[PDB]
Design a protein around this ligand. Structure first.
Ligand SMILES: CSc1c(Br)cccc1CC(=O)N1CCC[C@H](C(N)=O)C1
Ligand SMILES: [Zn+2]
Length: 139
């Protein structure tokens, strides 16, 4: 579990969105596993605007942060699950690192700010949904 709070927005994994998130929906994209809902309180997370390929992510299954090198956002095949049929997930970045299903929502950050959130994994890999292209998160 986990979310990004920037201004009046809350960014979460679309498969973990609550009733409240959907009743306050701003934008959602099944192909990216992202959903953004509005908030009353102010968010103070900074979103990175960069092309970094190194950063640090929070891994709840280990209560630890890990440094990673990750790939550029791209279309990657993701196996079927209780939330989605088998499909290509866009804007996804992979890294070699530990992740378990409950790790989704852990933040990936670089020196410039928040890069994305854990969205997929397995087999010694971790996948992050990128948010650096969502320029509207700051306006
Ligand atoms: C492959 S199970 C797993 C592992 Br292992 C580590 C980390 C995470 C998982 C769960 C997982 O990847 N998915 C279930 C939830 C929705 C995800 C998606 N984006 O389509 C797919
Ligand atoms: Zn960066």
């Amino acid at each position: 579990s986990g979310a990004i709070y920037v201004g009046n927005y809350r960014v979460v994994n679309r498969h973990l969105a609550t009733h409240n998130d959907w009743a306050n929906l701003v934008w959602e994209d099944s192909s990216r596993d992202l959903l953004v809902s509005s908030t009353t309180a102010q968010g103070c997370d900074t979103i990175a605007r960069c092309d970094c390929q190194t950063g640090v992510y929070y891994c709840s299954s280990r209560r630890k942060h890990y440094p990673v090198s990750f790939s550029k956002p791209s279309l990657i095949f993701v196996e079927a699950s209780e939330y989605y049929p088998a499909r290509y997930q866009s804007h996804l970045m992979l890294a070699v690192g530990h992740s378990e299903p409950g790790d989704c929502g852990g933040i990936l950050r670089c020196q410039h700010g928040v890069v994305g959130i854990v969205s997929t994994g397995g087999n010694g890999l971790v996948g992050f949904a990128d948010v650096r292209d969502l320029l509207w998160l700051d306006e």
